[PDB]
Ligand binder design. Structure first.
Ligand SMILES: O=C(NCCc1ccccc1)c1nc([C@@H]2CCCN2C(=O)c2c(Cl)cccc2Cl)[nH]c(=O)c1O
Ligand SMILES: [Mn+2]
Ligand SMILES: [Mn+2]
Length: 180
């Protein structure tokens, strides 16, 4: 069965992101053709992570998101075993070489703090930095430390709101917002 959402995702995100999202979904045994909202969210999370890592200096970020589970943890161990930083319980998204911390980036259709609090306790990792974006232009980061300058975060919020308008323009936003 062919859904409008899957066709929208494929023509809205670049092929490298879609491929990474598919490999991520099947690696954890899920179908992009059936669980299509999740497909859309994984693509979105991937793009935001990539836009985020583009915000810093050249060597600033190590990218963990978008890798095989095995090599992602391999890089995490290399980072920990060479910076002494604590090994997070669950896979982060980036490591900040400038601020010497892991970052878990979140994208939500709820209020940023409803989402941050749950991400805070689920990790329970005191060290890992959290940065949440919403589809309504809000953000919320650990210690009010937003890592990147304003322009790079504003770029991310703009893109998130364009995705939401594109889904709304195709009547897929309601099903997407309710499915989280
Ligand atoms: O790394 C992540 N999952 C590795 C397995 C990850 N997973 C989610 C959530 C929960 C899992 C699926 N998922 C999304 O659909 C996005 N959210 C993130 O922010 C994130 O980093
Ligand atoms: Mn991740
Ligand atoms: Mn994340």
């Amino acid at each position: 069965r062919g859904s409008h959402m899957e066709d929208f995702v494929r023509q809205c995100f670049n092929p490298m992101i879609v491929e990474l999202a598919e490999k991520a979904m099947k690696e954890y045994g899920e179908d992009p053709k059936i669980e299509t909202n999740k497909f859309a969210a994984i693509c979105t999370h991937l793009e935001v992570c990539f836009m985020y890592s583009d915000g810093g200096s050249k060597h600033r970020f190590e990218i963990i998101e978008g890798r095989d589970r095995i090599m992602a943890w391999t890089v995490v161990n290399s980072i920990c075993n060479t910076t002494g930083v604590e090994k997070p319980k669950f896979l982060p998204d980036l490591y900040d070489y400038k601020e010497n911390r892991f970052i878990d980036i979140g994208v939500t259709r709820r209020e940023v703090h409803i989402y941050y609090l749950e991400k805070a306790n689920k990790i329970k990792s005191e060290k890992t930095h959290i940065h949440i974006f919403s589809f309504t232009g809000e953000e919320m980061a650990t210690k009010a430390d937003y890592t990147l300058d304003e322009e790079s975060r504003a770029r991310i919020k703009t893109r998130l709101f364009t995705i939401r308008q594109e889904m709304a323009s195709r009547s897929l936003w309601d099903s997407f917002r309710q499915s989280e």
